Ligand binder design. Structure first.
Ligand SMILES: COc1ccc(-n2nc(C(N)=O)c3c2C(=O)N(c2ccc(N4CCCCC4=O)cc2)CC3)cc1
Length: 126
């Protein structure tokens, strides 16, 4: 249902944010093993998140919920903007580029804040 998919997306989204924050703290402390394993976890969560939203969107469209469909389209563009920065961050880390990695973190952090706000809005709109 819209409700069971939404609740799972919320969990998956919260997990992705928490893992990102844990990964950031690890990096500032020079814990690279930890960092890479979180990158694998984050990418995984992002894929599961996209699949859930694609299903909620279809249900939102079918019930005529133009407000959710609009918000979900803003969240998804925002999410995909952040996901492009994440990809470059993974390519950098594997290349030993710490400086590039730190800059990507800050940028991703700021995109993430935009998605969090839109998340709060989607909750009220579905
Ligand atoms: C139908 O669509 C949604 C959308 C959002 C939710 N949802 N619910 C909650 C909650 N109940 O708290 C949360 C989310 C969520 O997705 N959150 C999040 C995930 C990922 C990002 N990122 C990651 C890096 C790239 C940028 C970016 O935006 C930002 C925010 C915040 C937590 C449910 C259903």
């Amino acid at each position: 249902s819209v409700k069971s998919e939404y609740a799972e997306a919320a969990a998956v989204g919260q997990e992705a944010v928490a893992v990102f924050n844990t990964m950031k703290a690890a990096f500032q402390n020079g814990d690279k093993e930890a960092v890479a394993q979180y990158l694998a976890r984050l990418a995984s969560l992002y894929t599961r998140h996209e699949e859930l939203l694609n299903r909620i969107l279809e249900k939102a469209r079918r019930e005529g919920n133009k407000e959710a469909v609009t918000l979900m389209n803003e969240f998804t563009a925002t999410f995909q903007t952040g996901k492009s920065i994440f990809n470059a961050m993974v390519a950098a880390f594997k290349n030993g580029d710490d400086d590039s990695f730190e800059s990507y973190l800050q940028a991703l952090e700021k995109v993430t804040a935009k998605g969090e706000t839109l998340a709060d809005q989607i909750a009220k709109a579905l």
